[PDB]
């Protein structure tokens, strides 16, 4: 079989007549309500594309369209970003001077009293502070002005309005068969190759002729005025080579291999820029150079039209041995015929890459002026992490109903998904043992620590000065790391990072970035995360593999994914279902995410940023520490939350006003919550059945009747609550203490 | 018990002591045919052309297992319970008929002769054996 | 916490796997349970979580208004 | 009144706080005229002004005044429901009406809600305005 | 400052007497 | 065991019956209803008190009801 | 001079009280006899 | 190339997995001959050599992390702490032994446990000769760690 084009015109009409009519797309919600039940069931079940049809191909038509519409609304986001920048904002002034005006969208009405929220953000500018860093992407971009703001920003709005177009015409239109969508070869060909090889091709055309010159005059310091338009780059060929003496010789040594020519704008330098603090935007151009080839190249690995390449189902049935029967049989059927087992994959593993970006953006700071705004610093590292950990649930949440919808025993017989189901008692009992191990081994140094402390007995604890745990092979592999140029990697001038070593590089007299030493404190918490991601991973593997049954009850999924309960007996069977295992691991990925960006937070001030005095001295935010301090349980509650709360509690009647108002309604949602989570609806009920009769006494009864939450609904709304709420507290804590000392 | 053990390679979901100490249970059918099923310890097994038997260690795993084999049409499973001292007994289903179907030579067991609002209250039965469901 | 808003039948389900891990271990196969493991009932989880929860509230408390007061006056 | 209630315009810490009085609006003397109606007020010593709720009419305005009008709004907005509700329960499908609402059974109930007392009235002595405790269902005692 | 030995030893030969006593009284309250 | 009684208001539809995961329940002849059935409980020894019966009968408040009471083996649902 | 008796009576009501409650305790709660 | 996971005993029904980590012949040699499973031993002698181990490796984290570890006391201190845990330990045992335990278990390593650890004369034996090993064995680890300036000075 071929990959072709095949279409059926015109599926769908475009008409208003089920706006009308909410809940058409379930034949048990079309009835319409009898209870507030139905409310709810109206928004559980609106995406839930399995229920409205049984037939894959109008199930993947739907869920194509509906990715247009969500790509509609991500531009719309972007491009006002893009217009915030244009329009009310600082950024003509920032550019002039980086370390000393804050960077600022987002100008406040004067209503109530609200304009005290524009603070003294500098620029001759009043506003809100941001904190997600578009000022310096602009910056790497080489936006120099906002009349390009503009422009993009209405880029932006007609590239939205033609992805929702997108939507409409292929899905009432023209909308694609079952077989364009199994075609996973060549999308993983068309991907690999348009949407990221010659994207990222693209992109260093972009940072070659427009990035660079402009940031290289910017890094000499020009003016924002005099740096000339970028098209005049192109045209005028003496002013790159004015810059960029590699112009001179032309595309002829690409062509003829002699690449060394190329090595002004395309270097292996390694470290940071020292004028910015950020990554070398000719590094950043070979990167791209490099990862462009790769890509493309990789793209050619799938058999498509023309008989060369690969079977991506010959591929995983060749890879069987002889621990796990016949391997990867069956595993291209899973892929190719439930949209929830790719869902899985692919949220697990994008959650995954997000934990990575975060870790590798505040060490290697790739935008000028970045590594010098310890508030961006600290908030885009959090945020992406927390979408990280955010999209690793659901990667499991969509595994689980994998699991109980689209699992065959058939096409999954003797294979490694078949194998691992059973030995599941094998699996999680030794994940239960390894998350009691890391518990005692990692929790309780930090309850000897604190008793030891307390008792008076400080040469008895687990730190530096005492028993000690030093790191030896993460101290090793940043040994490695430190004296990789010219050794391991012979052309790289300076190291990677300069969290493995190589000296303090401050700009502007902060900290861009220094050596992240580790010693027994490191040790503790690098444990307390593997303790905290191994129960995460415990509760919701566990709840993939003992989704379709237990021991307590066999048929779980006849019961389906999301279920409350099994009633009261064999013990009680309250949250077996998948989807609670999905809500008891929601909180252990908070607890464990929560504790990462703590551990970033103090480590990072305690013992990288601060200020570098003239001789070369480096004084921190909060003084060294962290060696001593962060290993007992008293210490991170006074010296980490109790001390940086100072901020967000002081702020009132100033600029931060509205951090500490969100401080303390984010406790609200936070213990809100609580009361979602520790009742049950029984309860509800009973008490509505009351406020019911009050009203069929004063003839006010609805003839909606009124329901309590069902068991899911009310555990669902704790968890949300819960996870705003705190992390609600932990924003507003954030941001109330970096924009004061950093 | 008399029939073939169903084709897979074992899992740790299956029996454990209890079956030797106290209790296990035992699902035979006759296929006509052989197909793949799902167990309800986890995992896929084949079934093969004829009688089966595949022991269980709880009543309910082979009721579950029998209402899948509903959905091959296959409706002549019966449950064994078996213990230690090698007696079998025939439980499910226990008349011959399943008791979704009545049958007649069936007694009432624990039927009371009034609606449910009709029962006395504790402190009327209170400070003997009895309770309020009882009779 | 854990009491009040993790239920039974997870930690159930968690037991029977550690029953099967006991019982399949070697040398601690010698020794076992003469009464069978099971989770917590659900209204002794009710119980024990909210024990729990007083018991952290009243020692949280107290320990707050003595220090609290006594480092100030004695 | 208790606790050291001078009237503000007397009160040297309500004219250190009306000197460093912040704008609220984009009028440039919104916060010296927020000062000036607030002089007349009665105040603590810290110069914040404290209301009176007890019902005199030398302080009305307090809460005596806003009680009448959120009266008379609330029980404009009770009345409008009530009698929106009871005016669907008679057309066929109820509970389609709740979720979907008729503009033209319920906009002429929204202008009609302006004499709710007098209408609330009338349904209270003319026994309509409750349904007796034998047509209305509870649970067994 | 404190009480004499002889009266801590006093003391706690008397609290023999009601622990005999709650002895008795727990396992009668058993049975 | 736990007890499972069963009360006049029956209508003999049979869903208990099929509801029940550990055969607990039967249907037997009856002519107190237009089906001339009943549902009857022999088996409560195999009783988990899972509640599905109460879930599965359809007239108003229940014509089946599970009391539960003493956990045995069977009772607890335990395979081990 | 009788501030000896804490070195007796704590370690007993600490080790002692406990090990001979909890196995007295554990013998009584899994006899069958009573 | 083969299949080295199976079925136990050649039955897929039981709890049961025959893998190389529970069914190796080196395995299966190192398990059934440890002194809880080998033949040919009472259970006096079971139990004395298992508390041979026990006491001696027991020595060593109450010496060298406990309170005492840096005075001159340490090693006595250590000694102490181990037969104390020896003796708990044998408390432990005594109280399993009659408390009338169930029985031991064979599994896919040991075929057949031994009959000392199935009623309750083999286990109050058992744990008899654990405290004499366990207070034996704590004992030689404190004279080999205490006088280990000495037996190196011989050389
Ligand atoms: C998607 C991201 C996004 C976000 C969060 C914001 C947020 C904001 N914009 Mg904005 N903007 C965006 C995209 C975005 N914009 C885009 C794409 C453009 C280009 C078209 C603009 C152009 C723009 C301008 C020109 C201005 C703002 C302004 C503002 C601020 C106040 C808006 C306000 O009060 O509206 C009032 C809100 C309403 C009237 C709500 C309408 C309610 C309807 C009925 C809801 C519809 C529901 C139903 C279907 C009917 C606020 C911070 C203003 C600025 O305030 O600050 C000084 C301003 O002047 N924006
Ligand atoms: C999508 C990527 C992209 C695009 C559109 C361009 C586009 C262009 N490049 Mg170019 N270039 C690129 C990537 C790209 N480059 C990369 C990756 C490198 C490094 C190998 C270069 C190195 C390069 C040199 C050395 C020169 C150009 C030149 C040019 C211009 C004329 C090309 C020509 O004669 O045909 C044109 C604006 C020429 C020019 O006049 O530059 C302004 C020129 O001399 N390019
Ligand atoms: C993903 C990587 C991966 C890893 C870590 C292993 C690991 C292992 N393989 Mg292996 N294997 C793999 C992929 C992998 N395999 C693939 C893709 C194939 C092709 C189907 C095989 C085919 C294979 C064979 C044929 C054998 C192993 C064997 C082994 C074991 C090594 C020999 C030993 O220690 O004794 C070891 C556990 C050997 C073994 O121990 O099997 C009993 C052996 O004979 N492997
Ligand atoms: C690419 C991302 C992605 C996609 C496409 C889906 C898609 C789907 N998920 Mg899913 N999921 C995701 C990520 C994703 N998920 C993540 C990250 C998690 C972990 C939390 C989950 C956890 C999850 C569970 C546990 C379940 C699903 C289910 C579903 C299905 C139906 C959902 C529905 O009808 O929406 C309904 C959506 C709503 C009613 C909106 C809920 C409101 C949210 C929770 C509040 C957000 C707060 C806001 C951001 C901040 C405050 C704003 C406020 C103050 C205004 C659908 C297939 C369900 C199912 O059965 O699938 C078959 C199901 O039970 N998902
Ligand atoms: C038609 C609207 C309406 C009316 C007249 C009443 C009337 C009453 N409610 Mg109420 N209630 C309503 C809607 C309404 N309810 C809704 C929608 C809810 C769910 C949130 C409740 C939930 C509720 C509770 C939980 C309680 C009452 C109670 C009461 C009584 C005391 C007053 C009070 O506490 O108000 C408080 C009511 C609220 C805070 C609900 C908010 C009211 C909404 C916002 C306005 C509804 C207007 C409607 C949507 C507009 C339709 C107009 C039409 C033209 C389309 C009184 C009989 C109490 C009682 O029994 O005391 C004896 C009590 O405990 N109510
Ligand atoms: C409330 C009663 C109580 C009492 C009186 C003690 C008393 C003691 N504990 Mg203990 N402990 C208790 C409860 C108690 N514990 C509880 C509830 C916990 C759990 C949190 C602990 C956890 C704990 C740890 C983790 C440690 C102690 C240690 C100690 C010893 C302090 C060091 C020292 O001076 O001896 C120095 C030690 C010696 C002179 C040798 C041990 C002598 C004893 C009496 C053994 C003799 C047994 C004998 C052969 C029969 C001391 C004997 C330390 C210790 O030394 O333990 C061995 C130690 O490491 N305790
Ligand atoms: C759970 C973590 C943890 C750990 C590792 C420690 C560790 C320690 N504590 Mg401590 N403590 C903790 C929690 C912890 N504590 C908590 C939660 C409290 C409650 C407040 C205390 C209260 C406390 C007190 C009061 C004291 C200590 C003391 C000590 C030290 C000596 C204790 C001793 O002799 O151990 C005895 C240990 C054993 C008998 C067994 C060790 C376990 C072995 C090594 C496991 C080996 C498994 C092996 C790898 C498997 C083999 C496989 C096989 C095939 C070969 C030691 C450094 C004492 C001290 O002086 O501090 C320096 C002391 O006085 N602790
Ligand atoms: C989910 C995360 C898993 C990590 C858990 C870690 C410990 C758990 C181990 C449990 C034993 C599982 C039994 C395996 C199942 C089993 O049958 O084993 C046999 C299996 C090979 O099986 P076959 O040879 O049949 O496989 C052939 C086909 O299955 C296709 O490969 O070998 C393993 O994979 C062992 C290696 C796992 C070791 C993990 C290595 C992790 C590498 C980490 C690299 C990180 C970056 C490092 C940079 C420095
Ligand atoms: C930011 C943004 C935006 C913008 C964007 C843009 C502006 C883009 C562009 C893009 C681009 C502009 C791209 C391009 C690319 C290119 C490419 C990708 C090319 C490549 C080529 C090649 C591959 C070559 C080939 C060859 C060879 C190799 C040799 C032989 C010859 C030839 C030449 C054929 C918008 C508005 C949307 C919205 C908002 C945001
Ligand atoms: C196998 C193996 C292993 C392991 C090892 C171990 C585990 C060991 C142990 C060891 C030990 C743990 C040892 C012990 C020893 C002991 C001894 C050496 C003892 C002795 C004792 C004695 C001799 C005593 C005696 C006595 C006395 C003196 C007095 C009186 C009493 C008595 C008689 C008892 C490893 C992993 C590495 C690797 C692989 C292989
Ligand atoms: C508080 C609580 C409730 C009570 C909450 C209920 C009944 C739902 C909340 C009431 C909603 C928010 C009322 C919405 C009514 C109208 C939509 C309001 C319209 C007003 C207009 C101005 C829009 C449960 O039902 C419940 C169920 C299960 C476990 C725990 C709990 C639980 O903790
Ligand atoms: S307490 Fe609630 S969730 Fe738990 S078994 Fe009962 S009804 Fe189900
Ligand atoms: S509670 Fe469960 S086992 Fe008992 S009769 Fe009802 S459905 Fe059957």
Not at chain 1, 4 to 23: L, M, N
Not at chain 1, 354 to 361: K, Q, R, S, Y
Not at chain 1, 591 to 599: A, C, G, R
Not at chain 1, 616 to 628: D, E, K, L, R
Request: hydrophobic fraction near 45%.
């Amino acid at each position: 079989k071929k990959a072709r084009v095949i279409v059926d015109k015109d599926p769908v009409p475009t008409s208003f007549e089920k706006w009308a009519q909410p809940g058409h797309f379930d034949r048990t919600l079309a009835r319409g309500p009898k209870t507030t039940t139905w409310i709810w069931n109206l928004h559980a079940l609106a995406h839930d594309f399995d229920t409205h049809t049984s037939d894959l191909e109008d199930i993947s038509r739907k869920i194509f369209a509906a990715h247009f519409g969500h790509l509609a609304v991500v531009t719309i986001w972007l491009s006002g970003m893009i217009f915030h920048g244009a329009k009310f904002s600082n950024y003509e002034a920032w550019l002039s001077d980086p370390l000393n005006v804050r960077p600022s969208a987002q100008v406040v009405w004067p209503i109530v009293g609200q304009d005290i929220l524009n603070g003294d953000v500098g620029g001759g500018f009043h506003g809100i502070q941001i904190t997600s860093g578009l000022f310096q992407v602009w910056r790497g971009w080489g936006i120099t002005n906002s009349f390009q703001l503009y422009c993009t920003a209405i880029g932006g709005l007609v590239l939205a309005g033609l992805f929702l177009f997108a939507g409409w015409f292929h899905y009432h239109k023209r909308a694609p068969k079952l077989e364009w969508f199994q075609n996973v070869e060549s999308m993983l060909n068309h991907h690999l190759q348009v949407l990221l090889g010659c994207g990222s091709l693209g992109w260093a055309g972009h940072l070659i002729h427009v990035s660079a010159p402009i940031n290289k005059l910017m890094d000499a310091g020009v003016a924002v005025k005099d740096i000339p338009l970028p098209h005049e780059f192109i045209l005028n060929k003496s002013l790159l080579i004015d810059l960029f003496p590699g112009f001179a010789a032309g595309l002829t040594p690409f062509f003829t291999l002699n690449w060394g020519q190329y090595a002004d704008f395309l270097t292996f330098k390694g470290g940071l820029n020292p004028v910015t603090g950020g990554l070398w935007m000719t590094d950043i151009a070979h990167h791209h150079l490099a990862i462009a080839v790769v890509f493309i190249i990789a793209g050619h690995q799938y058999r498509t039209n023309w008989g060369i390449g690969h079977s991506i189902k010959e591929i995983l049935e060749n890879h069987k041995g002889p621990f796990t029967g016949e391997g990867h049989k069956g595993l291209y059927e899973n892929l190719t015929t439930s949209w929830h087992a790719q869902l899985a994959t692919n949220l697990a593993f994008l959650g995954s890459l997000t934990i990575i970006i975060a870790h590798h953006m505040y060490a290697m700071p790739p935008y000028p002026y970045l590594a010098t705004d310890y508030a961006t610093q600290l908030c885009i590292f959090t945020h992406h992490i927390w979408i990280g950990g955010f999209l690793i649930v659901g990667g499991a949440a969509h595994a689980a109903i994998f699991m109980v919808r689209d699992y065959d025993p058939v096409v999954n017989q003797n294979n490694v998904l078949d194998r691992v189901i059973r030995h599941r008692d094998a699996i999680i009992s030794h994940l239960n043992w390894v998350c009691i191990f890391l518990g005692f081994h990692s929790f309780g140094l930090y309850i000897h620590n604190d008793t030891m402390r307390a008792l008076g007995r400080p040469q008895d604890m687990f730190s530096d000065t005492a028993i000690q745990l030093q790191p030896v092979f993460a101290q090793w592999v940043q040994n490695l790391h430190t004296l990789a140029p010219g050794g391991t990697a012979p052309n790289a001038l300076e190291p990677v990072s300069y969290a493995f070593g190589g000296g303090v590089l401050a700009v502007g007299g902060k900290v861009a970035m220094m050596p992240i030493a580790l010693g027994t404190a490191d040790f503790l918490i690098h444990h307390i995360h593997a303790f905290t991601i191994h129960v995460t991973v415990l509760i919701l593997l566990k709840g993939v593999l003992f989704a379709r049954s237990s021991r307590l009850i066999p048929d779980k999924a006849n019961l389906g994914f999301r279920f409350p309960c099994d009633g009261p007996g064999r013990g009680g069977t309250c949250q077996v279902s998948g989807w609670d295992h999905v809500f008891l691991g929601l909180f252990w990925m908070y607890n464990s995410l929560s504790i990462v960006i703590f551990h970033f937070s103090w480590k990072m001030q305690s013992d990288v940023w601060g200020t570098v005095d003239a001789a070369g001295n480096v004084s921190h935010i909060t003084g060294g520490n962290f060696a001593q301090s962060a290993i007992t349980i008293n210490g991170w509650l006074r010296d980490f939350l109790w001390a940086q709360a100072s901020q967000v509690i002081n702020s009132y009647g100033s600029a931060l006003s509205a951090y500490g108002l969100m401080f303390l309604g984010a406790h609200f949602v936070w213990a809100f919550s609580l009361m979602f989570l520790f009742s049950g609806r029984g309860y509800w009920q009973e008490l509505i059945e009351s406020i019911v009769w009050a009203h069929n006494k004063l003839k006010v009864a609805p003839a909606i009747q009124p329901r309590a939450l069902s068991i899911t609904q009310g555990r669902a709304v704790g968890v949300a609550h819960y996870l705003l709420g705190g992390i609600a507290t932990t924003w507003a804590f954030f941001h109330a203490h970096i924009l004061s000392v950093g | 018990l008399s029939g073939k053990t169903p084709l897979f390679a074992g899992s740790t979901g299956g029996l454990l002591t209890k079956a030797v100490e106290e209790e296990k249970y035992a699902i035979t059918w006759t296929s006509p045919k052989a197909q793949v099923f799902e167990l309800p310890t986890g995992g896929a097994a084949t079934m093969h052309e004829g009688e089966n038997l595949l022991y269980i260690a709880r009543k309910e795993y082979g009721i579950a297992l029998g209402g899948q084999l509903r959905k091959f049409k296959i409706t002549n499973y019966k449950i064994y319970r078996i213990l230690p001292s090698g007696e079998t007994t025939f439980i499910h289903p226990a008349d011959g008929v399943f008791p979704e179907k009545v049958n007649a030579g069936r007694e009432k067991v624990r039927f009371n002769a009034r609606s449910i609002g009709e029962n006395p209250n504790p402190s009327q039965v209170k400070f003997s054996g009895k309770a309020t469901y009882d009779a | 916490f854990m009491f009040l808003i993790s239920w039974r039948g997870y930690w159930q389900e968690l037991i029977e796997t550690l029953v099967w891990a006991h019982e399949r271990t070697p040398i601690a196969n010698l020794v076992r349970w003469k009464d069978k493991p099971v989770a917590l009932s659900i209204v002794q989880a009710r119980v024990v979580g909210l024990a729990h929860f007083t018991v952290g509230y009243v020692l949280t408390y107290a320990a707050f208004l003595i220090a609290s007061t006594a480092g100030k006056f004695g | 009144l208790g606790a050291d209630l001078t009237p503000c315009a007397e009160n040297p810490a309500f004219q250190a706080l009306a000197k460093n009085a912040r704008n609220t609006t984009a009028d440039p003397q919104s916060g010296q005229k927020r000062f000036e109606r607030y002089s007349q007020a009665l105040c603590g010593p810290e110069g914040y002004p404290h209301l009176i709720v007890d019902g005199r009419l030398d302080r009305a305005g307090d809460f005596l005044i806003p009680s009448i009008l959120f009266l008379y709004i609330a029980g404009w907005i009770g009345w409008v429901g009530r009698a929106y509700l009871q005016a669907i329960k008679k057309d066929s499908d109820t509970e389609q009406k709740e979720i979907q609402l008729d503009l033209g059974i319920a906009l002429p109930i929204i202008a009609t809600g302006f004499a709710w007392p007098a209408a609330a009235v009338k349904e209270l002595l003319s026994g309509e305005l409750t349904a007796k405790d034998s047509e209305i269902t509870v649970s067994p005692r | 400052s404190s009480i004499s030995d002889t009266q801590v030893y006093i003391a706690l030969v008397v609290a023999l007497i009601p622990g005999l006593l709650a002895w008795r009284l727990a396992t009668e309250l058993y049975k | 065991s736990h007890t499972v009684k069963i009360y006049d208001t029956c209508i003999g539809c049979t869903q208990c019956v099929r509801a029940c995961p550990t055969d607990v329940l039967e249907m037997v002849p009856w002519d107190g209803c237009k089906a001339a059935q009943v549902a009857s409980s022999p088996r409560t020894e195999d009783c988990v008190g899972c509640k599905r019966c109460e879930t599965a009968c359809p007239t108003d408040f229940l014509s089946i009801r599970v009391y539960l009471g003493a956990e045995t083996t069977r009772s607890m649902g335990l395979a081990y | 001079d009788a501030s000896f008796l804490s070195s007796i009576f704590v370690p007993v009501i600490g080790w002692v009280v406990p090990i001979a409650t909890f196995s007295f305790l554990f013998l009584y709660i899994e006899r069958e006899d009573v | 190339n083969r299949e080295v996971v199976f079925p136990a005993g050649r039955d897929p029904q039981w709890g049961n997995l025959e893998t190389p980590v529970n069914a190796s012949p080196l395995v299966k040699w190192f398990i059934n001959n440890l002194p809880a499973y080998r033949p040919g031993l009472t259970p006096f002698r079971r139990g004395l050599e298992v508390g041979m181990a026990h006491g001696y490796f027991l020595f060593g984290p109450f010496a060298k992390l406990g309170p005492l570890r840096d005075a001159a006391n340490a090693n006595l201190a250590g000694l102490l702490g181990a037969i104390g845990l020896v003796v708990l330990f044998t408390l432990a045992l005594s109280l399993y032994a009659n408390s009338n335990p169930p029985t031991a278990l064979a599994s896919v390593t040991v075929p057949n446990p031994p009959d000392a650890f199935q009623s309750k004369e083999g286990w109050n034996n058992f744990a008899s000769a654990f405290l004499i090993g366990g207070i034996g064995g704590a004992v030689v680890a404190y004279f080999l760690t205490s006088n280990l300036a000495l037996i190196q000075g011989l050389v």
